[PDB]
Swiss-Prot record, chain A:
GN (gene name): ATP7
Chain's role: Mitochondrial membrane ATP synthase (F(1)F(0) ATP synthase or Complex V) produces ATP from ADP in the presence of a proton gradient across the membrane which is generated by electron transport complexes of the respiratory chain. F-type ATPases consist of two structural domains, F(1) - containing the extramembraneous catalytic core, and F(0) - containing the membrane proton channel, linked together by a central stalk and a peripheral stalk. During catalysis, ATP synthesis in the catalytic domain of F(1) is coupled via a rotary mechanism of the central stalk subunits to proton translocation.
Protein name according to UniProt: ATP synthase subunit d, mitochondrial
Subcellular location: Mitochondrion; Mitochondrion inner membrane
Main location: mitochondrion
Curated annotation (Swiss-Prot), chain C:
Modified residues (Phosphoserine): S5
Gene: ATP4
First and last residues shown, out of full length: 140 to 191 of 244
Function of the molecule: Mitochondrial membrane ATP synthase (F(1)F(0) ATP synthase or Complex V) produces ATP from ADP in the presence of a proton gradient across the membrane which is generated by electron transport complexes of the respiratory chain. F-type ATPases consist of two structural domains, F(1) - containing the extramembraneous catalytic core, and F(0) - containing the membrane proton channel, linked together by a central stalk and a peripheral stalk. During catalysis, ATP synthesis in the catalytic domain of F(1) is coupled via a rotary mechanism of the central stalk subunits to proton translocation.
Subcellular localization(s) per the UniProt record: Mitochondrion; Mitochondrion inner membrane
Assembly with partners or alone: F-type ATPases have 2 components, CF(1) - the catalytic core - and CF(0) - the membrane proton channel. In yeast, the dimeric form of ATP synthase consists of 17 polypeptides: alpha, beta, gamma, delta, epsilon, 4 (B), 5 (OSCP), 6 (A), 8, 9 (C), d, E (Tim11), f, g, h, i/j and k.
Transmembrane segments: none
Protein name per the record: ATP synthase subunit 4, mitochondrial
């Protein structure tokens, strides 16, 4: 249980490599270690909450208060119940947890195959020697669109060519 | 030498002596700077008393480190070293 | 590169649900011995007065 509680905490630290700067998840893990560490110490130092009427009371020959004190322990023996009040807001944190995780999982599951098909798309659809620029007009109207207003607005000169291909000047 | 430091009124036990000094052979120079090697040893003790009580037990009743026990101790030491 | 980025969290989000679940109880389940703390401290003063 105790080792099981933080066993899944060693899972989030592996999950924490991709998510850097976690404000409170580590703090919540820190909080769930802070209180839990307070738990084991509390129970180990917890003596049986009673006064030994056999020994610890008979050592006093002038008792006069222990029976009152022993009764005082017994009248408050039901000290106070637990507080399991969280049964509507705790799951409301979880209901957001189901909503966003499945939103993420549905997207990543779709995208991993969608992007994988893109890799299979590109490996066997590479017209690096036989593609048509008019086909590039067809694939993107922006390629078509970006040329007209280029002339009308007056940007006749076009840079960004000599970087890739030399101007091929004759001698 | 910074690791061997201890405080009075705080006796320790063999089952947690072994991990601290064993970490002194496989990863000690990568300790998180000198002034913070003390909580390094305390956190190592915590990481071995939690989620790793089997190692502490096995080394405390049998009193020695078997081959598989050496492998497990090395694995735990390097796991917290990566931590 | 985006293959790797998507594959970083392919298994994370559904495994964070039980992570998000259990973390909630492990944080907010410290009330039973908090009441025991009330009786443990009640025991110490009971021992203290009789020792006194």
């Amino acid at each position: 249980a105790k080792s099981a509680a933080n066993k899944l905490d060693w899972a989030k630290v592996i999950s924490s490599l991709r998510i850097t700067g976690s404000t409170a998840t580590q703090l919540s893990s820190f909080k769930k270690r802070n209180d839990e560490a307070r738990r084991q110490l509390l129970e180990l130092q917890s003596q049986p909450t009673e006064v030994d009427f056999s020994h610890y009371r008979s050592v006093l020959k002038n008792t006069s208060v222990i029976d009152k004190i022993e009764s005082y322990v017994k009248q408050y023996k039901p000290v106070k119940i637990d507080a399991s009040k969280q049964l509507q807001v705790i799951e409301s944190f979880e209901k957001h947890a189901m909503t966003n995780a499945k939103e993420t999982e549905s997207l990543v599951s779709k995208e991993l195959k969608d992007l994988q098909s893109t890799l299979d798309n590109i490996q066997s659809a590479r017209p690096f020697d036989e593609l048509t620029v008019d086909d590039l007009t067809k694939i993107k109207p922006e390629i078509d669109a970006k040329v007209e207003e280029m002339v009308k607005k007056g940007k006749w000169d076009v840079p960004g060519y000599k970087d890739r291909f030399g101007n091929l000047n004759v001698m | 030498t910074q690791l061997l430091k201890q405080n009075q009124y705080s006796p320790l036990a063999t089952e947690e002596q072994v991990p601290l000094i064993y970490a002194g052979v496989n990863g000690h120079l990568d300790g998180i700077e000198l002034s913070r090697i003390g909580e390094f040893e305390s956190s190592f003790l915590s990481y071995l008393k939690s989620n790793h009580n089997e190692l502490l037990t096995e080394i405390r009743e049998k009193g020695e480190l078997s081959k598989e026990l050496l492998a497990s101790l090395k694995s735990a030491t390097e796991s917290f070293v990566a931590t | 590169d985006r293959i790797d980025s998507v594959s970083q969290l392919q298994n994370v989000a559904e495994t964070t649900k039980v992570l998000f679940d259990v973390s909630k109880e492990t944080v907010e389940l410290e009330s039973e011995a908090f009441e025991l703390k009330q009786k443990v401290e009640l025991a110490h003063e009971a021992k203290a007065v009789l020792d006194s």
